Amino acid sequence: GSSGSSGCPICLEDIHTSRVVAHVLPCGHLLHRTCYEEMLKEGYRCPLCSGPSSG
Ligand SMILES: [Zn+2]
Ligand SMILES: [Zn+2]
């Protein structure tokens, strides 16, 4: 379950700035320097910010 839509939608693990760097998306979300590199390859953008048909 997930009540708060605040967290890396890639790995789904509470991000910890202190622990590791967080990539602030241009939409208003945080990611993991690593994850941000994975999603880019796959071909999917912020799966949280609903968009058009695609995505
Ligand atoms: Zn992540
Ligand atoms: Zn977003």
From Swiss-Prot:
Q: What induces it?
A: Up-regulated upon p53/TP53 activation.
Lineage of producing organism: Eukaryota, Metazoa, Chordata, Craniata, Vertebrata
* UniProt superkingdom: Eukaryota
**Modification(s) after translation:** Subject to ubiquitination and proteasomal degradation. Interaction with PLAGL2 or KAT5 enhances protein stability.
* Zn-finger segments (RING-type): 8-49
Any transmembrane segments, and where?
Answer: none
Query: What does the annotation say about its assembly with partners?
Result: Monomer and homodimer. Interacts with AR, MDM2, KAT5, PLAG1, PLAGL2, COPE, UBE2D2 and GORAB/NTKLBP1.
- Shown portion of the complete protein runs from 145 to 186 of 261
Job of this protein: E3 ubiquitin-protein ligase that mediates ubiquitination of target proteins, including p53/TP53, TP73, HDAC1 and CDKN1B. Mediates ubiquitination and degradation of p53/TP53; preferentially acts on tetrameric p53/TP53. Catalyzes monoubiquitinates the translesion DNA polymerase POLH. Involved in the ribosome-associated quality control (RQC) pathway, which mediates the extraction of incompletely synthesized nascent chains from stalled ribosomes: RCHY1 acts downstream of NEMF and recognizes CAT tails associated with stalled nascent chains, leading to their ubiquitination and degradation.
What name is this protein filed under? Answer: RING finger and CHY zinc finger domain-containing protein 1
Q: Where in the cell is it found?
A: Nucleus; Nucleus speckle; Cytoplasm
Describe, from its UniProt entry, the tissues in which this protein is expressed: Detected in testis, liver, kidney and heart.
